[PDB]
């Protein structure tokens, strides 16, 4: 299980690092570049960060809806591949023990 | 019973507050982008841009601080879910098909349980029939299984 | 030979024969996102991804240590130029 708080903190740290890198690049970028291109790049970065925060928003909404279905789902999956593993173990046991037959 | 309800209500309230704050952040980002696209270059517009940037930074910092509270009720998202949600739709078919597979597995489990039950019932009955002297352990075998 | 009266095996819990959904009162979410309603009709249109959860927000989603004051001043100077 991954804590939502850790994910939010990591996302915020990544956003801060990306913003700092963009600001630094704009700082050491030559002034010969038109301001329109820099504004467009900043708008694109802001849009990407907004999209990431909206993905976090959707995750928050899902957790608000949240685990009951998730818990049942995981339990039934565990039963399913436990049965499959039991079948495979039976097949392997017969294959091994056919020699002793 | 009351404690679980209180915890659920507190968690719902905290998640609603987080949802409202993130929605406000998204709206502020949209306004920031609109102002950037239609920036006139006037000093008043520049001051408004600076104020909007400061407000966005403060909102992000507050969201990070509140969401990182150890005492908050906020403290699973599989990678397959993240992969599935990258297709521009309304997230229902994945759940539909995977729950269908779950129900198929459960029906297979129930059918095989019924089959095995009838298998061992018939085997016990016939072992009692042709081998009465082993009848007593066989029932105990049922007691050992059931 | 192997018949040990002291060796007793208990029923596996929870029993898969019983309705495992209703064991812990876990029917609400299952009914919420059920394939079909009680009458068998389709409830909602079904799709794949999270896009329609953001349609209510404004926008056109067609395709789907640090000094803040100094950076703001730099951006202001760049825009005013």
Curated annotation (Swiss-Prot), chain A:
Localization terms from the record: Nucleus
Quaternary structure and partners: Component of the Mediator complex, which is composed of at least 21 subunits that form three structurally distinct submodules. The Mediator head module contains MED6, MED8, MED11, SRB4/MED17, SRB5/MED18, ROX3/MED19, SRB2/MED20 and SRB6/MED22, the middle module contains MED1, MED4, NUT1/MED5, MED7, CSE2/MED9, NUT2/MED10, SRB7/MED21 and SOH1/MED31, and the tail module contains MED2, PGD1/MED3, RGR1/MED14, GAL11/MED15 and SIN4/MED16. The head and the middle modules interact directly with RNA polymerase II, whereas the elongated tail module interacts with gene-specific regulatory proteins.
Primary role: Component of the Mediator complex, a coactivator involved in the regulated transcription of nearly all RNA polymerase II-dependent genes. Mediator functions as a bridge to convey information from gene-specific regulatory proteins to the basal RNA polymerase II transcription machinery. The Mediator complex, having a compact conformation in its free form, is recruited to promoters by direct interactions with regulatory proteins and serves for the assembly of a functional preinitiation complex with RNA polymerase II and the general transcription factors.
Family, as annotated: Belongs to the Mediator complex subunit 14 family.
Comment field (misc): Present with 319 molecules/cell in log phase SD medium.
Name of protein: Mediator of RNA polymerase II transcription subunit 14
Species annotation: Saccharomyces cerevisiae (strain ATCC 204508 / S288c) (Baker's yeast)
Record lineage: Eukaryota, Fungi, Dikarya, Ascomycota, Saccharomycotina
Swiss-Prot record, chain B:
GO molecular function per UniProt: transcription coregulator activity
Transmembrane segment boundaries: none
Transcription regulation as UniProt keyword: yes
Places the protein is found: Nucleus
Coiled coil: none
GO biological process: negative regulation of transcription by RNA polymerase II; positive regulation of transcription by RNA polymerase II; positive regulation of transcription elongation by RNA polymerase II; positive regulation of transcription initiation by RNA polymerase II; RNA polymerase II preinitiation complex assembly
More details: Present with 1472 molecules/cell in log phase SD medium.
PANTHER family: MEDIATOR OF RNA POLYMERASE II TRANSCRIPTION SUBUNIT 10
Name of the protein this chain belongs to: Mediator of RNA polymerase II transcription subunit 10
Protein source organism: Saccharomyces cerevisiae (strain ATCC 204508 / S288c)
Protein's gene: NUT2
From Swiss-Prot, chain C:
Cleaved signal peptide residues: none
Domain of life: Eukaryota
Subcellular location: Nucleus
Note: Present with 6116 molecules/cell in log phase SD medium.
Job description of the protein: Component of the Mediator complex, a coactivator involved in the regulated transcription of nearly all RNA polymerase II-dependent genes. Mediator functions as a bridge to convey information from gene-specific regulatory proteins to the basal RNA polymerase II transcription machinery. The Mediator complex, having a compact conformation in its free form, is recruited to promoters by direct interactions with regulatory proteins and serves for the assembly of a functional preinitiation complex with RNA polymerase II and the general transcription factors.
Subunit structure: Component of the Mediator complex, which is composed of at least 21 subunits that form three structurally distinct submodules. The Mediator head module contains MED6, MED8, MED11, SRB4/MED17, SRB5/MED18, ROX3/MED19, SRB2/MED20 and SRB6/MED22, the middle module contains MED1, MED4, NUT1/MED5, MED7, CSE2/MED9, NUT2/MED10, SRB7/MED21 and SOH1/MED31, and the tail module contains MED2, PGD1/MED3, RGR1/MED14, GAL11/MED15 and SIN4/MED16. The head and the middle modules interact directly with RNA polymerase II, whereas the elongated tail module interacts with gene-specific regulatory proteins.
Assigned protein family: Belongs to the Mediator complex subunit 19 family.
Record-given protein name: Mediator of RNA polymerase II transcription subunit 19
Species in which this protein is naturally found: Saccharomyces cerevisiae (strain ATCC 204508 / S288c) (Baker's yeast)
Full-protein positions shown: 15 to 148 of 220
């Amino acid at each position: 299980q991954v804590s939502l708080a850790l994910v939010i903190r990591n996302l915020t740290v990544f956003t801060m690092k990306e913003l700092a890198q963009y600001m630094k690049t704009n700082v050491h970028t030559q002034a010969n570049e038109p301001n329109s291109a820099k504004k467009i790049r900043f708008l694109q970065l802001i849009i990407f960060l907004r999209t990431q925060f909206l993905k976090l928003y959707v995750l928050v909404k899902w957790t608000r809806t949240i685990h009951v279905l998730i818990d049942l789902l995981n339990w039934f999956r565990t039963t399913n591949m436990n049965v499959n593993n039991c079948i495979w173990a039976l097949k392997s046991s017969l294959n091994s023990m056919t020699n002793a037959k | 019973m009351n404690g679980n309800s209180t915890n659920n209500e507190q968690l719902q309230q905290e998640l609603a507050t987080t949802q409202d704050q993130v929605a406000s952040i998204i709206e502020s980002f949209v306004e920031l982008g609109v102002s950037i696209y239609d920036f006139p270059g006037t000093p008043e517009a520049t001051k408004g841009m600076i104020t909007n940037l400061q407000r966005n930074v403060d909102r992000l910092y507050k969201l990070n601080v509140r969401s990182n509270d150890p005492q908050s009720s906020l403290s699973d998202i599989p990678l397959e879910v993240v992969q599935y949600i990258e297709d521009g739709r309304n997230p229902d078919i994945y759940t539909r098909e995977f729950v269908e597979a779950i129900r198929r597995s459960n029906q297979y489990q129930r059918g095989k349980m019924h089959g095995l039950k009838q298998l061992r019932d018939s085997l016990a009955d016939k072992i009692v029939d042709e081998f009465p002297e082993l009848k007593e352990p066989v029932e105990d075998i049922i007691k050992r299984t059931s | 030979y192997y018949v040990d009266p002291e060796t007793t095996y208990t029923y596996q819990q929870p029993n898969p024969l019983q309705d495992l959904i209703s064991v812990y009162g876990l029917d609400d979410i299952s009914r919420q996102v059920a394939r079909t309603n009680l009458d068998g009709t389709k409830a909602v249109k079904l799709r794949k991804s999270y896009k329609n959860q953001i349609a209510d927000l404004s926008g056109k989603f067609s395709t789907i240590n640090f000094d803040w004051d100094l950076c703001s001043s730099v951006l202001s100077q760049f825009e005013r130029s």
